[PDB]
Design a protein around this ligand. Sequence first.
Ligand SMILES: OC[C@H]1O[C@H](OC[C@H]2O[C@H](O)[C@H](O)[C@@H](O)[C@@H]2O)[C@H](O)[C@@H](O)[C@H]1O
Ligand SMILES: OC[C@H]1O[C@H](OC[C@H]2O[C@H](O)[C@H](O)[C@@H](O)[C@@H]2O)[C@H](O)[C@@H](O)[C@H]1O
Ligand code: CA
Ligand code: CA
Ligand code: CA
Ligand code: CA
Lengths: 338, 338
Amino acid sequence: CKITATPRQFQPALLSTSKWIWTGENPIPGGSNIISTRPFRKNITAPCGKCSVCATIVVASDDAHTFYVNGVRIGTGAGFRQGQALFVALQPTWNLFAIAGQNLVANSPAGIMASILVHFSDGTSETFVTDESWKTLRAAPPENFQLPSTNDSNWPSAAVQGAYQNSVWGPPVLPPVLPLRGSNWIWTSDNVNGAAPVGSRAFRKTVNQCTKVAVCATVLIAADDRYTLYVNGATVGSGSSYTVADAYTIPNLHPTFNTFAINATNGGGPAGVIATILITYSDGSNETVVTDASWKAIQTIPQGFQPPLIDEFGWESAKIIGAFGVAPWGAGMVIPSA
Amino acid sequence: CKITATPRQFQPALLSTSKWIWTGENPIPGGSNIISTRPFRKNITAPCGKCSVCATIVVASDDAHTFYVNGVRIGTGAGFRQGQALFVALQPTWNLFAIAGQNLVANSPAGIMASILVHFSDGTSETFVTDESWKTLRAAPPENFQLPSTNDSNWPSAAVQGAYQNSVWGPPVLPPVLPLRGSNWIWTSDNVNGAAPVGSRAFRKTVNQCTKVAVCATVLIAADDRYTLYVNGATVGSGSSYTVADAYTIPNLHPTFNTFAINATNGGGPAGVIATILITYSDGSNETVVTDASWKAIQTIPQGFQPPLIDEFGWESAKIIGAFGVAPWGAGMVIPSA
Ligand SMILES: OC[C@H]1O[C@H](OC[C@H]2O[C@H](O)[C@H](O)[C@@H](O)[C@@H]2O)[C@H](O)[C@@H](O)[C@H]1O
Ligand SMILES: OC[C@H]1O[C@H](OC[C@H]2O[C@H](O)[C@H](O)[C@@H](O)[C@@H]2O)[C@H](O)[C@@H](O)[C@H]1O
Ligand SMILES: [Ca+2]
Ligand SMILES: [Ca+2]
Ligand SMILES: [Ca+2]
Ligand SMILES: [Ca+2]
């Protein structure tokens, strides 16, 4: 169904309403459990009138986990001290989450905790969490436990080992929404010897995976001194800090061809813009695009620098000022939580 | 270099200045030659200040030929009574055309004739023809005779068998620039029982071959009752005949993503638009797009129906009224010569 949602400020999945769950082989919530691998399933149905588009996921585990969405493996992680961020495109009405958790220390606690923030076509969103509504088994995961087509109608409920505020684990640290390590500060080639002239500069990067279906994009960005961000010609947002980064979700990507454009301005001295972009596809894979030398850049901004299709003849390759961590900006950027 | 050339009316390549050439084993022009296969090469260099983009080609032979451009085989044909159309993308400055011709009847004349109309980045055009400036050999085509890297500086000239007006062959008929045969008359789904309401309708078809580099597109189009054609949102032209088809060349295609849009109007009774589109890629292949059900269509034309990227949500599949040749329009369209 029709997608009304427009680019907006990124909205985090939070763990404070989720519960730790496990099988209940030991009925003491948070008691000791054996080394084992156990399966967990959760079905979700769109409310009448709207279609689910994509999801933001934070997951932590004692001890480890493997995360599937509609049968596609989307991540593996471990540890209860820090959560792990995942992004996945969804089907319009029915969606299946499946986690294979592992207890790797004998006679130790066990549990998985996840928060799934589901975004709908009209712009609203709903948080689903780990709780007793997840199915589980008191045995190792059968073949294809993660496929929607496996029948779990008779599986028992998962057993809650503890709420977010409990006496066993404590609040897991939320990861950054997206990493900047691996992205680069870029600018036009008039940035030389640590400084750049005063004024504005434009940057383009197009993503065109013609055999896949693009769905959602998450964007983390910062610039010295300020920026405005456009996707397919539409304004997403603006910022003016090179010490506090901004994050946006773009829920209306064109399905095959999308162009991100930046208009960054230098107020004086050093200049630079840095961004990490993650696009989710309908097949369950995703793509990370960073600011680097493949971005196109220009010093005199033509009118219509932000439309998707333009003649990129007079544009240069963006110059890399430095990988994230370079001076003066350093490694201390404040990054929104996933 | 920068492409200034804009959409324009298609310009036919003509044979009227080209000559029949062969090896000269028999020194009498147009005389008898033996059953054999013989090679022909021709180099072209772009004039100063402009870059060569693509070429339209008509070729005929006594008796048969295989046609290569920069080593890529692009067609095979035969016969001196009617010429054969080819379309190929070119490299900016140097290009090598090579033909392996065959005489298949003993003690019979032999000759190949070609006209190559090259279009430059600025919109100008120049015709290269088969003549004595082509290299040949008095032997079978060596291995890799068609590669640009093969050395022909010591090869002898080809021998002219006759001009366009000569006493052996006579003027070969020019083929249609493109076939309409195989394309379909399409319309919106309100066209039923041989008629459709009065009014305007919109149609879109996108070509996005993301691993190739698109260069030129040639378009053949007609409509009942009239149409206007757009490429990437830019106007190409308009026409108003279902008995006379129009041909355009588009020399400024975007290299990866191009959207064709038509706004057609029906004045009453039967309605339909039909088009064949040929796109050339830098690797020497081409792609033919025809009007069919994969075009998107809509009955109320939204503003911005012709921009490349739009939300194609409310658009239906185009309805096929019939393959070319169906009544009322019949098989008699007047089609520009290649
Ligand atoms: O380090 C990059 C930054 O350098 C210049 O601004 C630095 C400012 O840092 C502190 O805010 C300090 O209080 C100020 O006095 C100082 O100007 C430059 O103006 C910025 O555009 C940016 O390149
Ligand atoms: O066959 C399609 C054609 O049908 C209608 O054509 C009728 C008119 O055609 C000639 O213009 C003739 O001179 C007129 O006498 C005759 O009324 C329709 O009008 C056309 O738009 C077209 O659909
Ligand atoms: Ca444990
Ligand atoms: Ca600065
Ligand atoms: Ca012959
Ligand atoms: Ca009509």
